[PDB]
Design a binder for this molecule. Structure first.
Ligand SMILES: O=C(O)[C@H]1O[C@H](O[C@@H]2[C@H](O)[C@@H](O)[C@@H](O[C@@H]3[C@H](O)[C@@H](O)[C@@H](O)O[C@@H]3C(=O)O)O[C@@H]2C(=O)O)[C@H](O)[C@@H](O)[C@H]1O
Ligand SMILES: [Ca+2]
Ligand SMILES: [Ca+2]
Ligand SMILES: [Ca+2]
Ligand SMILES: [Ca+2]
Length: 198
């Protein structure tokens, strides 16, 4: 474990960090605290900490409270070793179509959803821990476009609502090495046959 070279620093920001297409923002272990961008409550008018344009990547940051509106992903994004110390309204939202992968890192203290999927996408969560959350993944309510979710080597503890919820019959969830402790229900999809192991 080579600790990142910005470890121990705290970057205080006052606007959304925009990562452009083809860029990788590498925080090298920096912790970010946002000011004037929200309080991390359930209010829907907060700003995202990061906006990842299509084809942009993000790695090696710790997002401190307040989590605001977390990370907005416009598709074809890799989000690697990001730690949400205290999720805000939500941790990450898929805002436009593409593949989005969350690999490594962890999330704690999500009052509602950790990941909100608001456009058709392929959404993978890999080597990830979350504790004290309402839901790990929510396809935006009452939408019927298709998402495909993969949960691979995911460990969850204290899930108040469910692991994942969608109102879309054509969406699917696939999981592989999923460990869940203390959860109300695992999956709230129209039918349980939308959920698969692999
Ligand atoms: O991208 C967003 O932040 C998203 O937030 C709202 O929607 C989510 C979710 O997609 C909705 O189904 C709805 O969730 C239900 C309740 O309102 C919520 O408080 C909780 O009890 O879970 C419910 C459920 O999962 O069905 O509201 C969610 C929310 O409050 O964050 C916005 O409505 C949506 O437009 C978008 O901004
Ligand atoms: Ca909410
Ligand atoms: Ca919301
Ligand atoms: Ca949100
Ligand atoms: Ca929180």
């Amino acid at each position: 474990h080579h600790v990142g070279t910005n470890t121990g620093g705290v970057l205080v920001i006052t606007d959304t960090i925009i990562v452009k297409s083809g860029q990788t923002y590498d925080g090298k272990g920096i912790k970010i605290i946002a000011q004037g961008m929200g309080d991390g409550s359930q209010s829907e008018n907060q700003k995202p900490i990061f906006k990842l344009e299509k084809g942009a990547n993000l790695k090696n940051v710790i997002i401190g409270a307040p989590g605001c509106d977390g990370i907005h992903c416009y598709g074809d994004n890799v989000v690697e070793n990001v730690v949400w110390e205290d999720v805000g309204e939500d941790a990450l939202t898929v805002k436009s179509e593409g593949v989005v992968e969350v690999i490594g890192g962890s999330a704690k203290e999500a009052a509602d959803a950790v990941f909100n999927l608001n456009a058709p996408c392929t959404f993978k969560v890999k080597n990830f821990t979350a504790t004290n959350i309402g839901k790990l993944v929510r396809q935006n309510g009452n939408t019927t476009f298709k998402v495909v979710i993969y949960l691979e080597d995911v460990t969850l503890n204290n899930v108040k609502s469910c692991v994942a919820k969608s109102d879309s019959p054509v969406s699917e969830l696939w999981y592989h090495n999923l460990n869940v402790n203390n959860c109300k229900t695992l999956f709230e999809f129209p039918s349980q046959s939308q959920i698969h192991q692999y």
